[PDB]
């Protein structure tokens, strides 16, 4: 900062060693200050130093904190909490179907997010597990959710391209029907009546499952749950009960937010504490041995 002559003495090896200091020791703001002083001294800019700092620090994208705009992604789920356990009277085969009424491809610069599938709950609590309540995370981003966006199979932020007839991202007037087998861990997808060559196997079945769709701006879709609530466009696979049959008698099937906090006035906002685990949702006969 004091001597301009120092800048001429500084060379490519020294300017690399300064960055290696940040790399090996860690995030330290005075190293960045030294690098700033290297660029311009006494109102005079050094093109060589400015070029070297750029070409040796920026392209790596491993030290400086990267930044980006991510669209908000919300998730809607039905009231049904279907699960599997020993000595429990719930059917192990289930089926529900999604109708995409309209979906704008690019409402913003980033492509719209539309993933549909099943998600699990850690334990028997009604909270979805392993995922943040808000952010850009949807179905298939955490390891507790299993989604299908039209071209990829999503699970734990990892997408694998799945082969399907007429491959395309989910658009207007596309029908997605999901199948879940809890007897042997199996999640199957069925697009527009054609079979998706994708498969989810041997996942954890300890927790309770539920249908879920993760959407972004410009999404208008409908849940065809079967029976009273909806009618399936395509016939369910043999031995696959519709999802509306899992609703408890006195409880009414409604579609709510997957998370407990939603958009509303701050003073009207209902703050929810921890909720009791819904172990009573699963029914298991416990007679005392005599």
């Amino acid at each position: 900062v004091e001597s301009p002559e120092a800048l001429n003495i500084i060379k490519e090896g020294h300017i690399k060693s300064i960055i290696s200091l940040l790399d090996k020791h860690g995030r330290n703001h005075k190293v960045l200050d030294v690098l700033c002083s290297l660029c311009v001294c006494h109102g005079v800019a050094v093109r060589s130093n400015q070029h070297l700092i750029c070409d040796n620090l920026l392209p790596g994208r491993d030290l400086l904190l990267q930044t980006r705009l991510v669209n908000h992604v919300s998730s809607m789920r039905p009231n049904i909490f279907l699960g599997v356990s020993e000595g429990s009277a719930q059917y192990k085969k289930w089926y529900y179907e999604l109708m995409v009424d309209h979906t704008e491809p690019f409402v913003t610069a980033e492509a719209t997010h539309l993933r549909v599938g099943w998600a699990s709950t850690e334990g028997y609590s009604p909270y979805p597990g392993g995922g943040e309540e808000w952010g850009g995370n949807g179905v298939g981003d955490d390891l507790f959710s299993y989604g299908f966006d039209g071209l990829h199979l999503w699970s734990g932020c990892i997408a694998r391209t799945v082969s399907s007839p007429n491959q395309h991202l989910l658009r207007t007037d596309d029908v997605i029907s999901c199948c879940l087998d809890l007897s042997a861990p199996s999640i199957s997808f069925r697009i527009n009546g054609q079979p998706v060559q994708g498969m989810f196997e041997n996942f954890n079945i300890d927790g309770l499952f539920f249908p879920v769709v993760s959407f972004s701006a410009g999404i208008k879709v409908r849940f065809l749950l079967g029976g009273r609530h909806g009618e399936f466009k395509f016939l369910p696979p043999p031995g696959y009960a519709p999802c509306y049959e899992a609703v408890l008698p006195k409880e009414k099937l409604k579609v709510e937010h997957s998370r407990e906090y939603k958009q509303e006035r701050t003073y009207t906002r209902d703050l929810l504490g921890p909720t009791v685990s819904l172990t009573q949702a699963a029914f298991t006969p416990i007679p005392v041995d005599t």
């Binding site: 980006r68 705009l69 999404i219 879709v221 849940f223 579609v255």
Partner: peptide, 15 residues
């Protein structure tokens, strides 16, 4: 059936 409709864009910057 049940309809889900979101038409307004909302973005956040992630670090």
């Amino acid at each position: 059936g049940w309809l889900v409709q979101c038409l307004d864009p909302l973005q956040f910057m992630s670090l």
